RNA sequence: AGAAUUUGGACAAACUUGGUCAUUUAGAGGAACUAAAAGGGUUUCCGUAGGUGAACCUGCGGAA
C-alpha cells in the first residue's frame, strides 16, 4: 500500500512513480533494474502474452518459449544487449524494461520469435538495431 | 578254416611306348587396333530424493 501524504509529499506525480517501482519488482525485474524506473522519468514496460501474438497450444507453445529464451538463455541475453533493454521471460508471459522505441524493437523481435522467423534473420536484425539505435545519424 | 604252390578263363589296378582329341603356357619374330594428361525452457519461487556448512548444487514434479 502506498498513499500520499499532503503535509510532506510534494511531487504531485510521485504516487504513481512509486506505484509504477512497486509493480516492476512484482513483475519479477531485479531491484537495482527497478530503481531505474524511480531514478530516470523515460522508462516504459511494455507486458504481453505469447497466445496475443498467436494461439499456440500444447508443444507449440513450450517451443515459443523456447525460441524466445533459446539455450542458456542465449537469445534472450541477445535481444536485451541489442535493444538494450530488460526481459524477463515467465512462461508466456514477457515483460520488457526499456525505452519507447527499444522496447518497440525487442518487441519486433520477440514477435518474430513467437511467430516463427528463422533465427539468422533475428541474429542479423539484432545486430543492425543495435548499431542504428547508438548512432546519432 | 585258411593253405604255400600249379594249369586254364574272365575282371583288372599300375607302367613303357607310337598316335589322335581337348586344355593351359614359354621365349623370339611378323602384323592390326585401341589407349596415352601441363594447368530452442532463461528468470523468480514451492514440494520432494540425493548429495550436502541441507548454505548450496543436481534430478523429478508444480506456480507466475
Known amino acids: 500500500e502506498l498513499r500520499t501524504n499532503p503535509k510532506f509529499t510534494t511531487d504531485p506525480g510521485a504516487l504513481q512513480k512509486g506505484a509504477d517501482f512497486i509493480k516492476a519488482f512484482t513483475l519479477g525485474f531485479d531491484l537495482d533494474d527497478s530503481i531505474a524506473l524511480l531514478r530516470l522519468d523515460d522508462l516504459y514496460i511494455e507486458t504481453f502474452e505469447v497466445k496475443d501474438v498467436k494461439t499456440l497450444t500444447g508443444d507449440?507453445?513450450?517451443?515459443?518459449?523456447?525460441?524466445?529464451?533459446?539455450?542458456?538463455?542465449?537469445?534472450?541475453?541477445?535481444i536485451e544487449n541489442a535493444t538494450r533493454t530488460r526481459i524477463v521471460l515467465a512462461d508466456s508471459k514477457i515483460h520488457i524494461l526499456g525505452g519507447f522505441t527499444h522496447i518497440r524493437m525487442a518487441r519486433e523481435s520477440v514477435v518474430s520469435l513467437i511467430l516463427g522467423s528463422p533465427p539468422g534473420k533475428v541474429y542479423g536484425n539484432l545486430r543492425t538495431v543495435a548499431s542504428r539505435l547508438k548512432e546519432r545519424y
Not at 533459446?70 to 537469445?75: A, C, Q, Y
Open 60 to 78: 507449440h507453445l513450450s517451443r515459443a518459449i523456447g525460441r524466445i529464451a533459446g539455450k542458456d538463455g542465449k537469445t534472450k541475453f541477445a
